[PDB]
């Protein structure tokens, strides 16, 4: 249950994507984030002012968050930060970094081609940011020299100086996380034969990226406000709060920290070695060694499943779970937690056919009706019935499980010392049992049809199976050979209208899939209906009279 907030409530109209500037990370940050140690202020069970809650979110459950006073269910996480000793590439941008080096001068930071070249001014025209970059790259990738002077937009005899620097451009190729270039050179007009082979430093690529003009990077995919190229190179790493990397604290004295917590620790661990290594008597090879390891961890934390094979693995052999891996399809945030969801007010059991049920009704076993609960508001129309169900308790059929006051507090009728003496008030919700003739959404998975999920009238019945009319067998595609089905219960008088008025079984009869009725008379009834209608088939008074009474809407004639 979440508390009242004086803050204007709106809906999200736009999602403006971008990159975090290192300046923003240091601003939004509630803590920095210096010690790999989780908590235990020298074994003393409570969070260290180093990693998790040096003002972040909050473990302990009891003991609320130091910053947003709220605590647990209300307190979102609070982001921190780690100021990295040397800059490092963000894994995901490794090639959009490389491709930007390929378009710009590796010394002056100017586009290798401009409004002077015609193929370039053609690509510069493109409106789609992704396609405009695509064309600009395929053009500037070949340009192996930064041009000093280029022929004027008329004659080759008079040449215009487009911009300074003449320097030869390196032939950039990647070596799993590192960018190694190979400058063309000169030496007595020839050379290469054997060029200049040196790996491009993260910091030098950054300084060039900083120098790329607004107009320039803007001509490429980029945006000056939300995504400048310099921001693809990580300077200041954001520390995600505990809600993101929960401490699965089994029992009292036993940690159980998340993989992301371990991985961030490894980053910190490596970041400290590098920092000290350089500040101290710098043995150079040792630095480029400790740097490359930091690049590894910062990389493997976001994505662990990289082509350049060392797959960072927890000492257990089992690899560390990437942030990428967490978001990756079918079962995994987007697909498994957002597009799909495990829900409440849902029930499932074996299905069985009933010829005495109506087309649109579903047989609901008592046990399930007694568990599933609709929240009805105490109104002058219901008050009297409602109190009787409240009195009836959570144990007998037409009964109720909870009562909810204006004060927002839940009253468990199963335990309340006031379960008998309970006087309802208008505006209170009574969580009553699923009763006869309530609309419920009934579905049989897979669900490749709009008709695989239809609304039905509840019919509370004995025996553990969901009973269903035989003609509705086909749309769901269910047989009674051990097939099971789902039942979802609407909570609003509004979500109910949607079920009853749009997706009820009778509405769903004549299908748009093939402009024909999608339900008919199947099995027994079909077989008997033939046998019954032959010219040879005659029925005596006795039976006729029963068959007439059996039709519920009989004229009595």
């Amino acid at each position: 249950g979440q508390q009242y907030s004086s803050a204007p409530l709106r809906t999200v109209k736009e999602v403006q994507f971008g990159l975090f500037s290192p300046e923003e990370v240091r601003a939004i940050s509630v803590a920095k984030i210096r010690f790999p140690e989780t908590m235990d202020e020298t074994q003393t069970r409570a969070k260290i002012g180093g990693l998790n809650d040096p003002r972040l979110g909050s473990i302990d459950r009891n003991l609320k968050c130091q910053t947003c006073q709220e605590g647990m269910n209300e307190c979102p996480g609070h982001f921190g930060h780690i100021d990295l000793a040397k800059p490092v590439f963000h894994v995901g941008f490794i090639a959009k970094i490389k491709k930007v080096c390929e378009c710009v001068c590796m010394h002056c930071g100017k586009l290798l081609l401009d409004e002077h070249n015609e193929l370039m001014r053609q690509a510069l025209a493109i409106k789609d940011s992704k396609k405009r970059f695509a064309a600009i790259w395929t053009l500037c990738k070949t340009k192996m020299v930064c041009e000093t002077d280029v022929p004027s937009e008329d004659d080759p005899t008079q040449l215009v100086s487009r911009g300074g620097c003449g320097n030869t451009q390196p032939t950039i190729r990647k070596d799993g996380l590192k960018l190694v270039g190979s400058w063309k050179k000169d030496r007595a007009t020839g050379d290469a034969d054997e060029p200049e082979l040196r790996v491009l430093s993260t910091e030098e690529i950054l300084n060039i990226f900083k120098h790329i003009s607004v107009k320039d990077f803007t001509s490429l995919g980029f945006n000056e406000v939300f995504s400048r190229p310099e921001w693809m190179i990580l300077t200041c790493l954001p520390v995600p709060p505990p809600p993101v990397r929960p401490s699965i604290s089994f029992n009292e004295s036993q940690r159980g920290e998340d993989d992301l917590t371990f991985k961030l620790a490894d980053i910190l661990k490596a970041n400290i070695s590098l920092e000290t290594l350089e500040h101290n008597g710098a043995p150079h090879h040792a630095i480029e060694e400790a740097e490359s390891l930091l690049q590894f961890h910062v990389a493997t934390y976001m994505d662990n499943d990289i082509a350049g094979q060392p797959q960072a693995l927890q000492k257990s052999g089992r690899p560390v779970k990437s942030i990428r891996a967490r978001l990756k399809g079918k079962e995994g945030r987007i697909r498994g937690n957002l597009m799909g969801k495990r829900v409440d007010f849902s029930a499932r059991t074996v299905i069985s056919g009933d010829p005495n049920l109506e087309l649109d009704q579903v047989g609901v076993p008592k046990s399930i009706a007694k568990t599933l609960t609709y929240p009805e508001v105490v109104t002058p129309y219901n008050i009297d019935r409602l109190t009787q169900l409240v009195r009836n308790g959570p144990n007998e059929h037409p009964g109720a499980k909870y009562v909810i006051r204006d004060s927002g507090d839940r009253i468990d009728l199963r335990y309340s010392k006031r379960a008998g003496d309970i006087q309802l008030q208008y505006g209170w919700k009574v969580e009553r049992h699923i009763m006869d003739n309530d609309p419920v959404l009934f579905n049989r998975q897979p669900s490749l049809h709009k008709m695989s999920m239809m609304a039905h009238r509840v019919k509370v019945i004995p025996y553990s199976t969901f009973r269903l009319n035989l003609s509705v067998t086909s749309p769901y595609n269910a047989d009674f050979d051990g097939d099971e089905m789902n039942l979802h219960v609407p909570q609003s008088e509004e979500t109910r209208a949607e079920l009853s008025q749009l997706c009820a079984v009778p509405l769903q009869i004549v299908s748009p899939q093939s402009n024909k009725p999608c339900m008919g008379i199947v099995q027994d009834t079909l077989c008997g209906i033939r046998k019954l209608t032959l010219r040879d088939t005659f029925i005596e008074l006795d039976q006729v009279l029963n068959m007439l009474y059996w039709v519920p809407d009989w004229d009595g004639v």
């Binding site: 204007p8 609003s492 509004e494």
Partner: protein, 171 residues
């Protein structure tokens, strides 16, 4: 100073109020919040003008809660003070530190240091006073202060002022 600002408050009405006395209940609920309210953005909202012609507009029914949200377009008299603004006000409180001045809805305090040197604190008077070679500044006395700086404090705006410069002080 003292403005006539066109503003608009989004009010969110419960369905039990969807009776004829709705435009009535809304207008009252507006005055409930807006009137007497104080922001740093617009200052003290004091009085809502033209009650009869308050624009309720159409209330949009909110998805899963039956409540309707209306943007109430209205016009009111506001008061937002600024630095450099010279205000006339009556004294309220007085101490060894200085004196406070009531200017409309806001209290402006004058430091002993933001006052001429000649005027000194006379503790031995009922009530406490500030005594110049010619002037006497005490509780009920009228003053003219230059507002030197403002602070937006929750449900108010307090300011610091000086009666040091020319054509300021006891009136």
């Amino acid at each position: 100073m003292f403005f006539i600002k066109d503003l608009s408050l989004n009010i969110t009405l419960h369905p039990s109020f969807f009776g004829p006395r709705m435009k009535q209940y809304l207008k009252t609920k507006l005055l409930e919040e807006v009137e007497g309210s104080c922001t740093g953005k617009f200052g003290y909202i004091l009085c809502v003008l033209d009650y009869d012609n308050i624009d309720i507009q159409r209330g949009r029914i909110l998805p899963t809660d039956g409540s309707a949200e209306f943007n109430v377009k209205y016009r009111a008299v506001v008061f937002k003070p600024f630095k450099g603004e010279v205000v006339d006000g009556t004294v309220v409180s007085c101490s060894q530190h200085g004196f406070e001045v009531q200017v409309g809805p806001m209290k402006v305090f004058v430091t002993k240091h933001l006052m001429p040197q000649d005027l000194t604190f006379n503790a031995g008077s009922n009530p406490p006073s500030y005594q110049s070679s010619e002037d006497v500044i005490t509780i009920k006395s009228r003053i003219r202060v230059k507002i030197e700086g403002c602070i937006s404090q929750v449900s108010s705006i307090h300011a610091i002022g000086s009666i040091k410069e020319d054509y300021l002080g006891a009136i």
